[PDB]
User: Fold S-adenosylmethionine synthase from Pyrococcus furiosus.
Amino acid sequence: ARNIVVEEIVRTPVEMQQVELVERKGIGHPDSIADGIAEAVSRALCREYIRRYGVILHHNTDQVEVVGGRAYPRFGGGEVVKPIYILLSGRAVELVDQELFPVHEVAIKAAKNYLKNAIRHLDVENHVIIDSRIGQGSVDLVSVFNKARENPIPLANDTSFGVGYAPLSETERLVLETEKLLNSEKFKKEYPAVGEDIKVMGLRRGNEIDLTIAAAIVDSEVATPKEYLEVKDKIKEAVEELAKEITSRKVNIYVNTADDPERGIYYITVTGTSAEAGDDGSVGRGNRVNGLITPNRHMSMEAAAGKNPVSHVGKIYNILAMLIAEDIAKTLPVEEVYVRILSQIGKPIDQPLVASIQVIPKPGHSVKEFEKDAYSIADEWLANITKVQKMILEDKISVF
Amino acid sequence: ARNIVVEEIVRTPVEMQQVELVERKGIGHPDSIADGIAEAVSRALCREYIRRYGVILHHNTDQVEVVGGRAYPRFGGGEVVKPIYILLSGRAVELVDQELFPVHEVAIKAAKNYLKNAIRHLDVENHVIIDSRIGQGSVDLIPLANDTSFGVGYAPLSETERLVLETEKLLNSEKFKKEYPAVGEDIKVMGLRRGNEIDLTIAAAIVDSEVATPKEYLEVKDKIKEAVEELAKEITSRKVNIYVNTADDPERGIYYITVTGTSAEAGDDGSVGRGNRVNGLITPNRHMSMEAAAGKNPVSHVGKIYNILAMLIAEDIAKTLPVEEVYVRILSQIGKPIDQPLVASIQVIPKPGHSVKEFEKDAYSIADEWLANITKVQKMILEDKISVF
Ligand SMILES: [Cl-]
Ligand SMILES: [Cl-]
Ligand SMILES: [Cl-]
Ligand SMILES: [Mn+2]
Ligand SMILES: [Mn+2]
Assistant:
């Protein structure tokens, strides 16, 4: 019934390709800040719609602009001189049966709460201005409930595709886990000088990987250039240990490569994010839903962060494509699998115009031998598509 | 000696894959409006820096937020009820040796001029609010790489890529607009190929002042369909199915009519880097860069230059040599001039019956000459001769 297509492709697996480039924008990167606020706003709206009406009402808050401020970092502690300005945009239902729903209150509080929990040394009350221009919508709940009855699985409202793949390469895992380690609670507690604005790039040529880390250091935690350099060495040491667990390839680690001590240049910040110094961010400019930027792979340009987890395929299909890919890679004799899913307007989101599965089989196997099981994995996930709504709101799946 | 590497790759060509997906967001789509404004602002800043100082000063205007308005379309002509709001962001040099450069004036003027020329039925003075929060820079009056920057491009386009690209270009061309003024600029095209059959879905905003009745609206949709059917026959002999404004439901009174020709009027939002790559397409069957070219300084941003150069190198190779596919990737080497990349990888599938040895030397030479003329590409960008979305 469902438009699922399984095909074999021939390609050099990424692990065997000569040049592989992978990047991850960490939590404090301005683009990832935009994504994180967008998603925090969406989840807060979902939960408050549920609390008041028992159902999620339509909204999309996948539009956030982070306008950088100005700052004077100094060893021992600088100051922010001009605040970061953040504009929340999108659309949400505001009039519910002639009654007013507190869209802007929920959104601004969610954005502020996200920043406080994400960027430890950022003074949100004084370093940030948050304004909201979220568009106004209206609905009658009887209609909402009737729409839910007519179509238990929501209808697609856009023509969009999501893209995912599996399994991850060593270089992909290295980049992902380097950022996760350095922004982990345990590491932050041990090394409070390491801010959250961390960008990780892995470039593999053959069996040698250059792993470059741009990590904003918090100037209130380093009194001297010497203490700053000791922090960079502690970053390098921790990532060296991590790399030995992920790959037996040679890994060269570089931290804050624009540093130039003789010219007095160090990557120190007041708050731990370069957004303080004038760098800007917006939604969908960084990691895909698997958490990575991967030009050796395939992606959708849809920004998952902030999109309605109930009906917007731009989020749902990018998550589902990754989950189907991971399932196939985990259970079948596959070297690589790429999943692309395209919505059809007016049809339920479990009836995509196509769900395309492209597989490189392991040597000694053919896709024909397992094509029906691959179909079945995609079919069961599409038939259970609404559970993605549940995993988002239970904070079980990240979208950047 | 530039580190250019030409190698053969063995992989299923896109045209032989069973399923291919291609999308293009047309000029009036909110995301493409953001991209277009971003690039229009950058080029206006470049020209005015040159006019005043003889050099381009540092800037990045790759941050634009299009916040949709409200509108009540009506057959015969509706009205915009709440204006579109556009925030310009990024950074530009504003203090030039203690004197003030009119960043915000240049930027707002450039944004308004772009909209005026791009969206025919948009009343910019009354339908749009443009504000600027571009960050303030300062300065006192072949570049080296400061980072590892990346560009990726490919050629030639597949039949489905060509159909999607040329469908939007046709419907938003002046010649077509003159004959069918009811067709707005907010056109989104999705192409799905399965085997030798292509499904083409077109969402095209129709201008409500140009259609007096539902009957005229349906006639306009049929003229879109007929025109694209003709175009498809020029590109492919695969079966092509064309669908226009598929969410329409006449019995329930739903038609894709707009006052201005862009869904930004009705509350849809856009921002930079959410849509087309520099070749004009969104192509999940290919390899794409995540960087937003629009608004980036074309003189100093290596990622923008390399993504354009990679496309130009690929297109040249595909046009002149016996290649079925070519993928071009360029990586800068930190601390070296940008015309001396860390690697320029040229990956080719030869046409059947051919081997790369026949033409590997010519492919190297094509890549070499483009890298040697990186300054020529920068000029082409400012002369509006190369599109970036
Ligand atoms: Cl290959
Ligand atoms: Cl098929
Ligand atoms: Cl990229
Ligand atoms: Mn960015
Ligand atoms: Mn969009």
